[PDB]
Design a binder for this molecule. Structure first.
Ligand SMILES: [Mg+2]
Ligand SMILES: [Mg+2]
Ligand SMILES: [Mg+2]
Ligand SMILES: [Mg+2]
Ligand SMILES: [Mg+2]
Ligand SMILES: [Mg+2]
Ligand SMILES: [Mg+2]
Ligand SMILES: [Mg+2]
Ligand SMILES: [Mg+2]
Ligand SMILES: [Mg+2]
Ligand SMILES: [Mg+2]
Ligand SMILES: [Mg+2]
Ligand SMILES: [Mg+2]
Ligand SMILES: [Mg+2]
Ligand SMILES: [Mg+2]
Ligand SMILES: [Mg+2]
Ligand SMILES: [Mg+2]
Ligand SMILES: [Mg+2]
Ligand SMILES: [Mg+2]
Ligand SMILES: [Mg+2]
Ligand SMILES: [Mg+2]
Ligand SMILES: [Mg+2]
Ligand SMILES: [Mg+2]
Ligand SMILES: [Mg+2]
Ligand SMILES: [Mg+2]
Ligand SMILES: [Mg+2]
Ligand SMILES: [Mg+2]
Ligand SMILES: [Mg+2]
Ligand SMILES: [Mg+2]
Ligand SMILES: [Mg+2]
Ligand SMILES: [Mg+2]
Ligand SMILES: [Mg+2]
Ligand SMILES: [Mg+2]
Ligand SMILES: [Mg+2]
Ligand SMILES: [Mg+2]
Ligand SMILES: [Mg+2]
Ligand SMILES: [Mg+2]
Ligand SMILES: [Mg+2]
Ligand SMILES: [Mg+2]
Ligand SMILES: [Mg+2]
Ligand SMILES: [Mg+2]
Ligand SMILES: [Mg+2]
Ligand SMILES: [Mg+2]
Ligand SMILES: [Mg+2]
Ligand SMILES: [Mg+2]
Ligand SMILES: [Mg+2]
Ligand SMILES: [Mg+2]
Ligand SMILES: [Mg+2]
Ligand SMILES: [Mg+2]
Ligand SMILES: [Mg+2]
Ligand SMILES: [Mg+2]
Ligand SMILES: [Mg+2]
Ligand SMILES: [Mg+2]
Ligand SMILES: [Mg+2]
Ligand SMILES: [Mg+2]
Ligand SMILES: [Mg+2]
Ligand SMILES: [Mg+2]
Ligand SMILES: [Mg+2]
Ligand SMILES: [Mg+2]
Ligand SMILES: [Mg+2]
Ligand SMILES: [Mg+2]
Ligand SMILES: [Mg+2]
Ligand SMILES: [Mg+2]
Ligand SMILES: [Mg+2]
Ligand SMILES: [Mg+2]
Ligand SMILES: [Mg+2]
Ligand SMILES: [Mg+2]
Ligand SMILES: [Mg+2]
Ligand SMILES: [Mg+2]
Ligand SMILES: [Mg+2]
Ligand SMILES: [Mg+2]
Ligand SMILES: [Mg+2]
Ligand SMILES: [Mg+2]
Ligand SMILES: [Mg+2]
Ligand SMILES: [Mg+2]
Ligand SMILES: [Mg+2]
Ligand SMILES: [Mg+2]
Ligand SMILES: [Mg+2]
Ligand SMILES: [Mg+2]
Ligand SMILES: [Mg+2]
Ligand SMILES: [Mg+2]
Ligand SMILES: [Mg+2]
Ligand SMILES: [Mg+2]
Ligand SMILES: [Mg+2]
Ligand SMILES: [Mg+2]
Ligand SMILES: [Mg+2]
Ligand SMILES: [Mg+2]
Ligand SMILES: [Mg+2]
Ligand SMILES: [Mg+2]
Ligand SMILES: [Mg+2]
Ligand SMILES: [Mg+2]
Ligand SMILES: [Mg+2]
Ligand SMILES: [Mg+2]
Ligand SMILES: [Mg+2]
Ligand SMILES: [Zn+2]
Ligand SMILES: [Zn+2]
Lengths: 77, 110, 69, 116, 53, 141, 181, 101
RNA sequence: CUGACUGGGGCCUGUAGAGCACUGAUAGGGCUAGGGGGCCCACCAGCCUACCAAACCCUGUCAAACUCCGAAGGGUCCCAG
RNA sequence: CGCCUCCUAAAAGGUAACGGAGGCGCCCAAAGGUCCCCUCAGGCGGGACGGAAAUCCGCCGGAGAGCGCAAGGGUAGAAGG
RNA sequence: UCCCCCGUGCCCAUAGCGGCGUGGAACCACCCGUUCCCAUUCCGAACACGGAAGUGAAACGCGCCAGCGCCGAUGGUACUGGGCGGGCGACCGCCUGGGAGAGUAGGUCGGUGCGGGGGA
RNA sequence: GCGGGGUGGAGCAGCCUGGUAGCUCGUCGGGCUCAUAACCCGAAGGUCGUCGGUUCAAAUCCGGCCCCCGCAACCA
């Protein structure tokens, strides 16, 4: 008796890193994701693996714009 | 169900907003050509200029260059200098290119 | 159109064998045809060429009424 | 195509060429060249566009040719096959029609031998 | 990287030093790679040429 | 007997049997029903036994409706092996049935004809059952 | 622009008679021609001798317009087809060149056709467009027996501005299309 | 109320009453006691529809007339057991994952 | 004084339950390609189907690797005890 | 036996078993940068050779296509051509 | 400050599919041409230019209709944080706080910001 | 439990490296012989155990089930 299965991969620890109303510095990572679950909004960059991070010091805000997707922003302090 | 006109429109307009500038959007109809500079952060138009409002003459292309020198003229009076060109669905050429160059001679920065 | 990829259009003289001449444009200034719209069998109303047959068969034999009654 | 609906062989004498038409044989060739006064000896390449249309016009107008000829003969067998005539069954079973032995030969109607 | 997909270097065609390493498929691209790259020595762009690794 | 003709997956985790039925809880087709009083995995072998029994009473006549279906694959390790070396093999199929479902409904038959086949059917089952007839409550769902 | 017979005939005879039979209340409501597209699904040139400048040279003479290539959308085993392989030609005629082609087509081509018994009544789109096939390109006047290597016909699609087959049928018959039934 | 006894029933069949009512738009002042149905013509397996529904005054149908309403179907038979027990059933085929789908 | 826990407030989530819109499963009915069967034909179409049965519609259901839905909770940040 | 995807995993992250399923040990000189343009699968109807399926015309079709390769996520307001 | 139209946003189908009706003074569109800028793996179809004879036919805008789509209570239930009972179990109850989904009633043939152009 | 296998009627190739089914005998039709065999000349027949999947395309690559050969199954 034997298994032709057995394997799985290392977990990747994805998801939101900073929640709305939290104060972040320029560079802080905000959301780690596979594809654009959330989209970069004002003051928010997106890296080659979809990682949303803050472009300026300030405060996080989320916005759910329907068929336009969900967005993350940073508002200047 | 979108159309090539509509898609092309978003396609350039989306890239313009992302650079955060004031947008010099240009409308070009069969007879006339309009242009307004908009602050998308407020959803608000800050200055306008159009052939139809200036009652201008014949040649559409020179008409464009003139509504262009116009838009700048009103513009610099409001402190507006830096701005970004919204060629909409219109290829940067002809009438639209002409308005753009008019805005440039006027001193508007882009 | 693009230049240098396109055959050039000129006033043309299509001639038929009935002696119909057609005024048109073409890549060749002069052409002769064997047949046209002005003379074709199906075309000219119902000019039923070689056969106005009506079959003729099969009642049509009739040779003759000489078999007796 | 020239006459009639087909383009008869240029480089042959005008009388032979015509027989390259479905419906016109050696007889009908000399027969068309009589009633038009065209030389039976001349090569087809050497017809006047005048001689062409005259020879053209007679032949096409007197006799059923190429397409329609095939069409009637078709309908002729079509009906014979469909009335249930003896000659019909012979066409419908694909066998010969004219009182030939079938026990041997008969190949032209039958086709290559289907050996056993 | 494989037997057919080889590794290689780019040599500055002016100063002859290798400043960049990369790969190619030598079946798909039998000629030597030619590319302009910033050479840190000449301090400008130069046509760089594929050389044996 | 009953079993899926094909499936996305060969083996299924066991899960639970908590709660009353999610649906299937009202007469829908026939005149009378057999409803489950307690939870269980009813096997295809039982469903067919129960079915055959009912047609066997009717002889000629009636219509039988089977409202449950065995889509859950049942696993068993081969006899006398030890724990481990992977999941058992599929050996049969079961219908996951919670309290309150109608499993069988009958039609085109006298009431005593139906009470009795549904009864005989009921003995063939690993659970307690209640026989019910169509009410306006059933009509109203 | 060009004055030609069919273009003229459309406005002069076809237009009014159409307004008669169907009683349109707007000039633009009445049936028009938009485009005739010619096609050569070829594909005999898939591999073999994928040199079909002979037919592009042909179609260019027939229509006074350089055809464009069509290439394979997907690869096909049974057809021996690599995706993107060059398998056909297509020229789109509008306006003046559209008329001139139809003009020669109706006055010349269909007559020269083997045993011609009229265009197919039933090849009507349902939305008022029309399509027809040709077995031979010799059917045209500009292609002599000499300049051809092999028999190659074509697909011909004519688009109307009509909405029903019935207005389309009329527009085309009024122009000069010969229908059997 | 399926008036009549179907011919499909008299040959051994069963009248599968699919809908024992029908949805309907109508004024409160216009409530029918039922709607009668002629099922006497039905065979195995012949069927009536919402289309075949003959409506009382002032009452309009609220469903698609495509909807079937009653059917006459074959009965159970012990004689089918012989085939049904001797009808072969195969082990189930896995819908695939990976370089299989 | 920043702690466990607690109050208010925002943001995050896809479970329990449920659902069948997607991926699959699924009983019966309707409608209906394809075949099988029974009439009539080989002139190629037709007609009947208490036969097996696609797609669609209806009724009714199932699912860790299905979700149009979707909790209680839980995580985190601010102010306060 | 290392690495990736899904489920188990109890709606943050993490989470075991000789639990359930699959993939990787490559590839691309464009399958890379950018500017410009373009929109799919599928269904019905129509069309010479031409077929279930080549190419052509029309109408319906928000994404069921495509994105080299497994799966998930993402995606035509492009990441697809 | 009100009405219509042209721009450009926001809300993200209560905005959509379909059907009917309506608008050309103005604006927009189709439209008239292809000399010129520019353009077609062919085509002035598209993009583009110079235009103003016609037409609101297509498009668009504005209204109307609930067949489809979309939104959707109240009530009740499932489930459940915390607290307790019951069964050999599979499983089942009570208390307190929270509370779906389905379905029913019913709503919907869009609302609103800013700048232009016209009209009262 | 591990490795190998199923291809005209018999027995083997082709599978690894996807596009193309081959060899000997046998069968059938003809010839030599009085006749048969042998021998000579021509010719038929495998849709590759199945169902699924990958692919543009599968005898070939991957999975399922089926049947066959070989080896293993030990301390106990
Ligand atoms: Mg084993
Ligand atoms: Mg194993
Ligand atoms: Mg495992
Ligand atoms: Mg793990
Ligand atoms: Mg891990
Ligand atoms: Mg994982
Ligand atoms: Mg998250
Ligand atoms: Mg980047
Ligand atoms: Mg990237
Ligand atoms: Mg907010
Ligand atoms: Mg914000
Ligand atoms: Mg605003
Ligand atoms: Mg002859
Ligand atoms: Mg005889
Ligand atoms: Mg378990
Ligand atoms: Mg059990
Ligand atoms: Mg088990
Ligand atoms: Mg075993
Ligand atoms: Mg185990
Ligand atoms: Mg087990
Ligand atoms: Mg079992
Ligand atoms: Mg149940
Ligand atoms: Mg019992
Ligand atoms: Mg229900
Ligand atoms: Mg038709
Ligand atoms: Mg010719
Ligand atoms: Mg039309
Ligand atoms: Mg793969
Ligand atoms: Mg404190
Ligand atoms: Mg703290
Ligand atoms: Mg704290
Ligand atoms: Mg708290
Ligand atoms: Mg559940
Ligand atoms: Mg489903
Ligand atoms: Mg439903
Ligand atoms: Mg469950
Ligand atoms: Mg799950
Ligand atoms: Mg679930
Ligand atoms: Mg919450
Ligand atoms: Mg948790
Ligand atoms: Mg908390
Ligand atoms: Mg909180
Ligand atoms: Mg404090
Ligand atoms: Mg490693
Ligand atoms: Mg997890
Ligand atoms: Mg999880
Ligand atoms: Mg988790
Ligand atoms: Mg962490
Ligand atoms: Mg492996
Ligand atoms: Mg390229
Ligand atoms: Mg790319
Ligand atoms: Mg490029
Ligand atoms: Mg298509
Ligand atoms: Mg088609
Ligand atoms: Mg065909
Ligand atoms: Mg086709
Ligand atoms: Mg996709
Ligand atoms: Mg507007
Ligand atoms: Mg608005
Ligand atoms: Mg509408
Ligand atoms: Mg009007
Ligand atoms: Mg309108
Ligand atoms: Mg006007
Ligand atoms: Mg007017
Ligand atoms: Mg004009
Ligand atoms: Mg020019
Ligand atoms: Mg000029
Ligand atoms: Mg134009
Ligand atoms: Mg209109
Ligand atoms: Mg528009
Ligand atoms: Mg209303
Ligand atoms: Mg909603
Ligand atoms: Mg609801
Ligand atoms: Mg409630
Ligand atoms: Mg509890
Ligand atoms: Mg409870
Ligand atoms: Mg409670
Ligand atoms: Mg409460
Ligand atoms: Mg819930
Ligand atoms: Mg609700
Ligand atoms: Mg609406
Ligand atoms: Mg306004
Ligand atoms: Mg105003
Ligand atoms: Mg063998
Ligand atoms: Mg080998
Ligand atoms: Mg090979
Ligand atoms: Mg022999
Ligand atoms: Mg012998
Ligand atoms: Mg494929
Ligand atoms: Mg093969
Ligand atoms: Mg296969
Ligand atoms: Mg296959
Ligand atoms: Mg196999
Ligand atoms: Mg041994
Ligand atoms: Zn003529
Ligand atoms: Zn250098």
């Amino acid at each position: 008796g034997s298994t032709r299965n057995g394997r799985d991969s290392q977990a990747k620890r994805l998801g939101v890193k900073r929640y709305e109303g939290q104060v972040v510095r320029a560079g802080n990572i905000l959301v780690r994701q596979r594809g654009t679950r959330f989209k970069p909004g004002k003051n928010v960059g997106m890296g080659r693996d979809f990682t949303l991070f803050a472009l300026v010091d300030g405060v996080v805000e989320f916005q759910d714009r329907g068929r336009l997707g969900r967005y993350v922003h940073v508002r200047p302090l | 169900r979108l159309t090539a006109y509509e898609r092309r429109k978003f396609r350039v307009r989306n890239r313009i907003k992302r650079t955060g500038r004031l947008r010099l959007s240009v409308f070009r109809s069969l007879k006339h050509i309009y242009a307004q500079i908009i602050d998308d952060e407020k959803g608000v138009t800050l200055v306008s200029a159009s052939s139809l409002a200036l009652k201008l003459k014949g040649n559409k292309t020179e008409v464009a260059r003139q509504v262009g020198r116009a838009l700048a003229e009103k513009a610099l009076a409001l402190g507006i200098k830096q701005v970004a060109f919204d060629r909409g669905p219109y290829k940067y050429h002809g009438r639209v290119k002409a308005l753009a160059e008019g805005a440039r001679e006027g001193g508007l920065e882009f | 159109m693009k230049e240098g990829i396109h055959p050039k259009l000129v006033p043309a003289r299509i001639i038929c064998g009935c002696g119909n001449v057609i005024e048109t444009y073409s890549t060749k200034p002069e052409i002769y045809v064997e047949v046209c719209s002005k003379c074709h069998p199906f075309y000219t109303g119902q000019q039923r060429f070689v056969d106005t047959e009506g079959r003729v068969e099969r009642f049509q034999r009739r040779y003759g009424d000489s078999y007796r009654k | 195509a020239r006459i009639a609906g087909v383009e008869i062989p240029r480089n042959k004498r005008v009388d032979v060429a015509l027989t390259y038409i479905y419906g016109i044989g050696k007889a009908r060739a000399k027969e068309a060249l009589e009633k038009t006064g065209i030389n039976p000896a001349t090569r087809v390449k050497d017809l006047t566009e005048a001689e062409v249309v005259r020879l053209r016009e007679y032949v096409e107008n007197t006799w059923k040719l190429e397409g329609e000829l095939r069409a009637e003969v078709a309908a002729n067998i079509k009906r014979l096959m469909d009335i249930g005539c003896y000659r019909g069954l012979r066409h419908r079973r694909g066998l010969p029609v004219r009182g030939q032995r079938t026990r041997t030969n008969a190949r032209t109607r039958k086709g290559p031998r289907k050996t056993v | 990287a494989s037997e057919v997909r080889i590794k290689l270097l780019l040599e500055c065609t002016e100063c002859k030093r290798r400043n960049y390493a990369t790969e190619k498929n030598k079946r798909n691209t039998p000629n030597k790679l030619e590319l302009r790259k910033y050479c840190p020595w000449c301090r400008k762009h130069t046509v760089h040429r594929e050389v044996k690794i | 007997m009953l079993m899926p003709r094909r499936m996305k997956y060969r083996k299924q985790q066991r899960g639970r049997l908590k709660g009353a039925t999610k649906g299937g809880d009202y007469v829908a087709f026939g005149d009378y029903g057999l409803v489950a009083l307690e939870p269980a995995w009813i096997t295809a072998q039982q469903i067919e036994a129960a079915r055959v029994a009912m047609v066997r009473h009717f002889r000629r006549g009636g219509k039988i409706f089977i409202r449950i279906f065995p889509d859950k694959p049942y696993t068993k390790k081969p006899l006398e092996v030890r724990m481990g070396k992977g999941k058992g093999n599929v050996e049969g199929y079961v219908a996951v049935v919670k309290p309150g479902r109608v499993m069988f409904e009958v039609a085109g038959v006298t009431e005593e004809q139906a009470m009795e086949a549904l009864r005989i059917a009921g003995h063939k089952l690993p659970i307690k059952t209640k026989i019910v007839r169509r009410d306006a409550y059933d009509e109203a769902q | 622009p060009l004055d030609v017979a069919l273009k003229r005939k459309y406005y002069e005879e076809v237009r009014p008679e159409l307004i008669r039979r169907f009683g349109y209340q707007n000039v633009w409501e009445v049936p028009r021609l938009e485009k005739v597209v010619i096609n050569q699904g070829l594909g005999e040139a898939k591999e073999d001798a994928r040199i079909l400048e002979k037919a592009a040279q042909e179609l260019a003479l027939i229509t006074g317009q350089k055809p464009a290539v069509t290439r394979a959308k997907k690869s096909i085993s049974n057809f021996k087809l690599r995706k993107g392989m060059p398998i056909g030609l297509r020229v789109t005629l509008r306006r003046d060149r559209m008329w001139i082609f139809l003009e020669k087509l109706l006055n010349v081509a269909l007559p020269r056709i083997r045993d011609f018994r009229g265009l197919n009544p039933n090849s009507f789109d349902g939305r008022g467009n029309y399509n027809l096939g040709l077995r031979e390109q010799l059917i045209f006047p500009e292609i002599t027996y000499d300049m051809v290597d092999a028999l190659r016909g074509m697909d011909i699609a004519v688009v109307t501005t009509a909405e029903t087959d019935e207005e389309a049928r009329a527009l085309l018959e009024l122009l000069g299309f010969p229908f059997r039934k | 109320r399926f008036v009549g006894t179907p011919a499909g029933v008299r040959a051994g069949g069963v009248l599968q009453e699919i809908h024992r009512d029908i949805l309907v738009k109508v004024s409160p002042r216009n409530i029918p006691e039922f709607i009668e149905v002629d099922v006497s013509g039905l065979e195995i397996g012949d069927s009536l529809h919402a289309s075949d529904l003959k409506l009382p005054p002032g009452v309009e149908l609220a469903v698609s007339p495509e909807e079937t309403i009653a059917a006459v179907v074959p009965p159970e038979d012990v004689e089918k057991l012989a085939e049904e027990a001797a009808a072969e059933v195969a082990e189930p085929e896995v819908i695939k994952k990976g370089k299989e789908e």
